[PDB]
Design a protein around this ligand. Structure first.
Ligand SMILES: C[C@]1(C(=O)O)[C@@H]2CC[C@@H](O2)[C@@]1(C)C(=O)O
Ligand SMILES: [Zn+2]
Ligand SMILES: [Zn+2]
Length: 315
């Protein structure tokens, strides 16, 4: 084995650079190194609140990306366009790192590596795909079994359970993969108190955070997905008012231009998987936010070439 190795059992920037190249070239991280990253990131994640609360000073910025779905080559492209993560270039990836795309193992170990390297500046929130039900069906379990073992997959599942569910920046912008709630009256403190180390329930706020979608019309609707609800602009306004927030950023739906701003400015979607599943033809975006100005700035990008593996090849 001549690939990337941890230094004194820990991730370093030189290791991350070697890993990205190893992966670009379609090579596999030694099972022992993958194991070490999984055990170490589980420890880090298990210490975090369900609601990560981050302060951005007025000179600081942060980049928010939505779903990536195993599109490793597009992930590399985000880092080339926007710079590598660092203490001065923080990232939030908003769920759905795996499944559908056929380089899910490469995406997740790269993201985990950076979480380890910059724990206070590199943020991962759970998506509806960081769950067992979903992985068993949509490729990630298949991909892990092919590249490693069922045992490695079980370890991934355990780590996913520790991913936080939401992140609030400056007490003003709340970020979650899915969206808001099937019931009124949910508070930031309620989110902080969610016992999140589990597979999500079929209902309730942990389910909603991972699964809900905005709708244009006032009210709530039963979701077409068969889980959670669609929520209207009235739901969003009431939630922001109670919680003294300005707006929410969420992901979880493909958008032709990579983003959408709904509810009169209150509910932003960001989606970071361009030409989703080699078929959608959509643009992707990431968002920049600055401490001095938390309004969202959208940066669009398009798909780049990848090796000839079809989406869902391991599904
Ligand atoms: C279909 C998607 C998925 O399966 O995760 C994929 C495409 C849009 C968004 O990401 C989606 C709807 C989601 O629910 O996360
Ligand atoms: Zn998704
Ligand atoms: Zn989703």
């Amino acid at each position: 084995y001549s690939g990337p190795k941890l230094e004194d059992g820990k991730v370093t920037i030189s290791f991350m650079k070697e890993l990205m190249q190893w992966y670009k070239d379609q090579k596999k991280l030694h099972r022992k190194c993958a194991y070490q990253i999984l055990v170490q990131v589980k420890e880090v994640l298990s210490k975090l609140s369900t609601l990560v609360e981050t302060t951005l000073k007025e000179t600081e910025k942060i980049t928010v990306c939505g779903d990536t779905h195993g599109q490793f080559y597009d992930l590399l492209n985000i880092f080339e366009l926007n710079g590598l993560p660092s203490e001065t270039n923080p990232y939030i990836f908003n769920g759905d790192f795996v499944d559908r795309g056929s380089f899910s193992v490469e995406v997740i170990l790269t993201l985990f590596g950076f979480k380890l390297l910059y724990p206070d500046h590199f943020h991962l929130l759970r998506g509806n795909h960081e769950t067992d039900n979903m992985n068993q069906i949509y490729g990630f379990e298949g991909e892990v079994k092919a590249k490693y073992t069922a045992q490695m997959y079980e370890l991934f599942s355990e780590v996913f359970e520790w991913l936080p569910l939401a992140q609030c920046i400056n007490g003003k912008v709340l970020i979650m993969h899915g969206g808001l709630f099937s019931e009124d009256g949910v508070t930031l403190d309620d989110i902080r108190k969610i016992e999140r180390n589990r597979q999500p329930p079929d209902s309730g706020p942990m389910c909603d955070l991972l699964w809900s979608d905005p709708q244009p019309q006032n009210g709530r609707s039963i979701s077409k997905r068969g889980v959670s609800c669609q929520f209207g602009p009235d739901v969003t306004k009431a939630f922001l008012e109670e919680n003294n927030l300005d707006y929410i950023i969420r992901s979880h739906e493909v958008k032709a231009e990579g983003y959408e701003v709904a509810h009169g400015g209150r509910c932003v979607t960001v989606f970071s998987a361009p030409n989703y599943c080699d078929q959608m033809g959509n643009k992707a975006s990431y968002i920049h936010l600055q401490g001095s100005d938390l309004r969202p700035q959208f940066h669009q990008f398009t798909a780049v070439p990848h090796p000839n593996v079809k989406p869902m090849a391991y599904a």
